[PDB]
Design a protein around this ligand. Structure first.
Ligand SMILES: CCOP(=O)(O)[C@@](O)(CCC(=O)O)[C@H]1SC(CCOP(=O)(O)OP(=O)(O)O)=C(C)N1Cc1cnc(C)nc1N
Ligand SMILES: CCOP(=O)(O)[C@@](O)(CCC(=O)O)[C@H]1SC(CCOP(=O)(O)OP(=O)(O)O)=C(C)N1Cc1cnc(C)nc1N
Ligand SMILES: [Ca+2]
Ligand SMILES: [Ca+2]
Ligand SMILES: [Mg+2]
Ligand SMILES: [Mg+2]
Lengths: 814, 812
């Protein structure tokens, strides 16, 4: 008999959520319908069975469905049951009236929005108003913990309601020159009603693409946490900036970026100390029923991936919703992990204007038509329970009416009215740092020559690409800049060229040479920092995160590196919806850098191209900088210009692979100490050598590593009649520098754009159309030399590649 | 007290025993690991006997996760098969497992000894996946199933071809890196049984996990052909997806969650996938602590309550046993099973990798490791299962296989009308009113059904009905039609109503499904499969691509809510749809329907990015179209389904043009016409218009035609002509040249478009048209919106000014 009690306790803890009264529509008519009575007064801590069962039913089978026994941490399971399996204190009339006032503000906003403006039906929060007192309780609990800020990310349902009743934006600013308003960022201050603290509340900008903003929010919060010296890269472990992420039930279950973002939750390079998730679960996805949207019992079942606790709550019980919200903030503060709140509600109206939702969901909408709103339900529940009087309930209807009048009145009143060069001592210092090993550190035998070669390069020259990159980042850290670098295997580098972090051969202890540059020679800090990480095997969440990080800290140098440029198409929604277009659409600026290893080397269609043609197609004046440098020094100056120009604009860099080790692709010390970024490059024989530009009759215009192959061929045949000009900055086109460079070759009879990429790829589709228009006296008659148009970036054969590469070189000198 | 402590101990082993199980063959984590024993407890058994059953079941070389499963019958099924004294395998079964290890290791030695640059394809340290996969396929043949279809990354691929798919070495090493991405097909013959089963391998790009929904789609198409599964007569789901993964990719790629989310959906279920994660506890140079935020790489599978089995890759018997249990669970509950095989990567990730640079501790333990073949040969001696002579013979079975592959490869080196009759239209029209007895139509759906009967007999056929006329007529001709996308049954713009819902019961009725039956009552062989998809682009597009590969005879259409969200499926468009044919010889006839058009609804409700599909295009890879009339769309779909060519079709479809009263077609356009790649104004082909009066030619595509035609009619501009390019790719060079030759007095030609200057057809047409037709398009100018970093403005007011500005420039 005593063992059957233990199994009964576990059954309520494990599966009680399946019998909880969480659906305010009660659609499932089989949910509830599918030891002895003398054992109830027997004692089994010693408590009677009737008392054990009453605690279990109240905790697990009322308006809150708790999912927590999947959590592997026993201390976390114990923490939840200790707060859930107790007789809770009923809220004070003041707290209940405050919750009612929030529901009054929410429903008064939705009534106005629908009655005053046209085409607002799709933004309607009606049937889900309880999310306003729930979000209020989240932010108020964060202020109770003395935290610094809450950053919200959400889809567009109830967004202006959130702006007015959560962010605290006035109606004069919200409805000023009144649909882009449902995607813009906002910032405000939350002041506690019954407390003495305040907290910053901000809402991040987003596209229509549901859940795409999820990793953006995380990066943005992480950047703010790093600035406030809180969290993983902070002195305290408070993680004082809280991500509050809102979702829809269909989108939460169907979008892969949800799993990718949850996968970042505890990573040292990406953790934000736990996200508070709120799913506005109105049990519908436009016309689609949940049975066609997911293969699991709950829309939130993906969150079990990271062992997050889940609370299914009845959206018609605003007190249970406010209680769960506060418990969620307390759990996040105690364990630095994600908490998911699944708010079960309904969508009162159609999804949009042309929707009669009884066409596709006739049963759901026969039940929703008999439903009276949450505000009215809660007013009636408070009257029944004896908590408020008739006068008090009527006064709450007087508060509703007043809030409805104020928004109609306020809106009525509103309608009536730079050098990038460094000193040789800076290069030497970055070189010396690679040998300034901690006491007793063991370098791996194959890493030691790289360190010694870097000291040699810093003092003697022949600086390679990999070191030039670290010279740029190291000099920025020495000047006080925060640098964040990440990507797949970025600490070592895909091509074993970086070694930004080196690992002790015997202990596994990490050493970061560039971090020594954050301290001045006198011993004082520079204000700079080097944050280098290996990313998860993700493109979409990682690129979203880095974009978000640069928005969070405009003063940070943020670089994301693709393993190969070919895999960046996995992050196309971020490129399309945030990076390339956020500035023009929302006034949101980002200085994020994307490093894309690019080049035809015979390694196949997924190890050859970062799709230059796609970034060039996305480009429009001042949206991005797109470059393909051919020398280490020009790359060094490109990164330093980007970090010091005071302009917030993304930089797309097509980076080398075998050209990292090309002995001709090296730079002299003077190229770093007495030069600047060169958008257009001539051959050294004309600028430093004894070459004669007047002998040139054929001009080859190119970009990237093919330059070295063209230069080698010219040198082999002694072709003084051919000159090779490189376009280092692909976008914006360096019109003036290009014109001035070409004017130095007066006897040119023919001009050719030479590229490795197929004819429908690389720079030709845009340059072939743009160059003859922007410079008609220079490029009228411009012809193309490249691979044939292909449906893939290249051939699968390294043999077919080698024949095509030779064909390009032979055509250019034919 | 003592008896209740036993119940709590049993639950602890069932729930958390997997945390203490000896699953890691490297034992990296050095912190992961009596009088009541002879007393009998309640069945009556001694505590020592209860506890030994729990330790053997949950804390040996198999870590079982199943108490997260919400179905009590599934928890009970696992419990019963895991908590029993299992029969030890026969010497014949053990020697067979050893023979599979011998073949797999010899292959690896040969591959690393003979050829150069093969390091990254090495399965060394992970060879036990070969007897594990063998057990999966053998258990599927024991159930009498029809086929096992495999999807995997490139590690161990050529080993899988030779020792699983059964391909000979002469076919594998013929003209010997594209071989690590091609599809393959073979027959598996049972060693100790009398059944055989088909085994196939699907093609894939380098993008890890991108093939996951493609495999599901391919399998579902084969299941529908065999009349098995969700759309079948039997519930056997006799085509089994076997999906292999890596541990870093399984945890980090979102497409994994998206594909798992399809596992039980009526439109996407394949009756359960067998998942095998080759968990070598590393991703190139990255440790699991930088790859995931959970205890196991397989924790995502808990999303659909899938049972998970963590198995020690150095124990080939536990691996084979778990594989067979997984197939039995999939057969019993038609649900996914995940096998997490813990192993190691013996060598570097590739040529330039000394793995001890980044993982020095792991690789010092790996360097002391002897392979699972040598280990299992030794374990059989220790157990007394095999003799010295048997162990020596097994070592000479290894040597023989090693010789055979070197010798066989040595020996290798030495050597159509789309028009329908009026009766067909009338029949599809009549079907919309042929309601089942007692069916209640929603009051707003009834006029749609009555207007379709009217359109079928009287004309003025709109876009939405023209689509159903094309699909219906294909079903009547015996074709299988699969249509899906977000809210596709009704249509995003409430225009389709492919499925109608009973107002009082909620019962679904599919009017086009009546066309699957001939007037005499016999079946046509056709079928209409229409579904609402999950809120996914990547998995759904991958699935539909896979479905067309699985059934080349099927008409497969995927519909975006708005073309603006198809960029969420960019990896599928880039790696499969646009390039699969040229890269792998793999053909697909998948259709993508992308609602497109500038209407002032913002940058995410305006464009399907025409310019991107046109940039991806290369001769004969895809067909790209933007029809302006219902009849031309009807003929486009009918040509695509009847041309006998397996090529993807990209269609930019309307939104407000669905209800444009000028955008309607006559019955004769369906009964006495064909697809027209280039369209002239009806005043010149049927009316009294004079082509010789024309001095300005406006070339365009899509709905802007109607706005340009209305302006021409308003001002009576006989000097202007509007020519539409309906087929954007391949460019209809011949018909375009012939059409323009009919306007001899043209002095100026303009490409007119709604899209910004860097978007739409202009970036490609502006460069291509003057080159392919120099005598017609030299001097071709552009009329469009300015170049923009987004597909449009956020303002409907800015949109309206820009739209008017385009029309004014075209007639200025
Ligand atoms: C006409 C249908 O499309 P739409 O209404 O214009 C829209 O795009 C809305 C979002 C926006 O545009 O900002 C949305 S609303 C919606 C249903 C959402 O379901 P749920 O997640 O349960 O949220 P809800 O129940 O609260 O709605 C889809 C599929 N739409 C299109 C869509 C598709 N795919 C992606 C990735 N993002 C999208 N915005
Ligand atoms: C030089 C590193 O890149 P690469 O080796 O060329 C390659 O592309 C390989 C696959 C292929 O190209 O076919 C792979 S192998 C690999 C590590 C995989 O780890 P796991 O999932 O644990 O599997 P494993 O341990 O069995 O390897 C990555 C990140 N590479 C690049 C890559 C990135 N992102 C995506 C979506 N797909 C990829 N192929
Ligand atoms: Ca900048
Ligand atoms: Ca076809
Ligand atoms: Mg919803
Ligand atoms: Mg791995």
């Amino acid at each position: 008999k005593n063992a059957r009690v233990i199994e009964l306790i576990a059954a309520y803890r494990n599966r009680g959520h399946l019998m909880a009264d969480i659906d305010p529509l009660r659609l499932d008519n089989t949910r509830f319908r599918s030891l002895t009575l003398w054992d109830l007064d027997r004692e089994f801590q010693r408590k009677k069975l009737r008392d054990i069962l009453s605690v279990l039913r109240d905790a697990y089978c009322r308006h809150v469905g708790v999912e927590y026994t999947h959590i592997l941490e026993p201390e976390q399971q114990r923490w939840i049951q200790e707060r859930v399996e107790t007789k809770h204190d009923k809220p004070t009339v003041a707290e209940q009236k405050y919750i009612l006032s929030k529901l009054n503000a929410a429903e008064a906003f939705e009534t106005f929005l629908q009655t005053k403006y046209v085409g607002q039906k799709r933004f309607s929060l009606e049937g889900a108003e309880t999310v306003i007192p729930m979000m209020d309780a989240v932010i108020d609990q964060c202020a109770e913990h003395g935290l610094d800020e809450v950053v919200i990310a959400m889809p567009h349902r109830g967004r202006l309601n959130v702006l007015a009743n959560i962010v605290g934006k006035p109606y004069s600013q919200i409805f000023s020159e009144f649909d882009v308003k449902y995607h813009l960022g906002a910032t405000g201050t939350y002041i506690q009603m019954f407390g003495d603290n305040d907290i910053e509340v901000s809402l991040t900008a987003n596209p229509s693409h549901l859940e795409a903003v999820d990793p953006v929010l995380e990066g943005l919060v992480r950047a703010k946490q790093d600035l406030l010296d809180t969290g993983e890269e902070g002195s305290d472990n408070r993680f004082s900036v809280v991500p509050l992420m809102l979702h829809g039930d269909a989108a939460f279950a169907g979008q892969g970026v949800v799993a990718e973002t949850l996968n970042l939750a505890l990573l040292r390079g990406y953790r934000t100390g736990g996200t508070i998730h709120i799913v506005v679960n109105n049990q519908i996805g436009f016309t689609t029923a949940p049975t066609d949207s997911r293969s699991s019992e709950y829309c939130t079942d993906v969150a079990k991936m990271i062992g997050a606790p889940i609370f299914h709550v009845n959206g018609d019980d605003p007190e249970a919703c406010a209680w769960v919200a506060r418990l969620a903030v307390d759990f996040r503060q105690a364990f630095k992990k994600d908490v998911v709140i699944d708010m079960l509600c309904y969508r009162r109206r159609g999804h949009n204007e042309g929707d009669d939702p009884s066409m596709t969901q006739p049963y759901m909408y026969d039940v929703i038509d008999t439903k009276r709103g949450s505000r009215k339900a809660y007013t009636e529940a408070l009257i029944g329970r004896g908590d408020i009087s008739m006068k008090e309930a009527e006064d709450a209807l007087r508060d509703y009416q007043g809030q409805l009048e104020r928004v109609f009145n306020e809106v009525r009143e509103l309608e009536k009215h730079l050098a990038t060069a460094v000193d040789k001592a800076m290069l030497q210092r970055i070189g010396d740092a690679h040998l300034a090993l901690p006491e007793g550190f063991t370098v791996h035998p194959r890493v030691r020559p790289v360190l010694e070669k870097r000291r040699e390069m810093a003092y003697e020259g022949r600086i390679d690409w990999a070191f030039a990159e670290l010279l740029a980042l190291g000099s920025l850290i020495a000047e006080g800049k925060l640098v964040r670098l990440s990507g797949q295997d970025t600490q070592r580098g895909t091509f074993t060229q970086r070694h930004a972090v080196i690992v002790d051969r015997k202990t596994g202890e990490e050493f970061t040479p560039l971090q020594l540059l954050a301290t001045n020679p006198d011993g004082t800090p520079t204000g700079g920092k080097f944050l280098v990480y290996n990313s998860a095997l993700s493109e979409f969440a990682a690129v979203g995160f880095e974009y978000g990080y640069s928005v969070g800290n405009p003063d940070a140098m943020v670089l994301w590196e693709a393993q190969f440029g070919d895999f960046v198409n996995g992050a196309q929604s971020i490129i399309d919806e945030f990076i390339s277009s956020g500035e023009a659409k929302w006034g949101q600026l980002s200085d994020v850098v994307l490093l894309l290893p690019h080049g035809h080397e015979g390694q196949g269609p997924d190890h050859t191209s970062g799709r230059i043609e796609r970034f060039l197609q996305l480009w429009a004046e001042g949206s991005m900088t797109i470059a393909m440098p051919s020398t280490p020094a020009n790359y060094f100056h490109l990164l330093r210009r980007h970090g010091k120009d005071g302009i917030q604009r993304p930089l797309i860099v097509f980076t080398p692979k075998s050209m990292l080790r090309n002995k001709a692709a090296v730079s002299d010390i003077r190229d770093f100490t007495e030069s600047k970024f060169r958008s257009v490059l001539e051959e050294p024989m004309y600028t430093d050598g004894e070459g004669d530009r007047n002998k040139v009759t054929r001009l080859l215009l190119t970009s990237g590593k093919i330059y070295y192959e063209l230069a080698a061929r010219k040198a082999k045949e002694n072709r003084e009649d051919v000159a090779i000009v490189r376009i280092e900055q692909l976008a914006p086109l360096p019109r003036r520098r290009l014109a001035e460079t070409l004017d130095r070759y007066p006897n040119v009879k023919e001009k050719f754009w030479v590229q490795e990429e197929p004819a429908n790829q690389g720079a030709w589709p845009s340059f072939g159309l743009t160059l003859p228009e922007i410079l008609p006296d220079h490029f009228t008659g411009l012809k193309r030399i490249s691979r044939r148009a292909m449906s893939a970036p290249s051939s699968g054969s390294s043999k077919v590649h080698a024949v095509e590469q030779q064909e390009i070189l032979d055509t250019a000198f034919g």
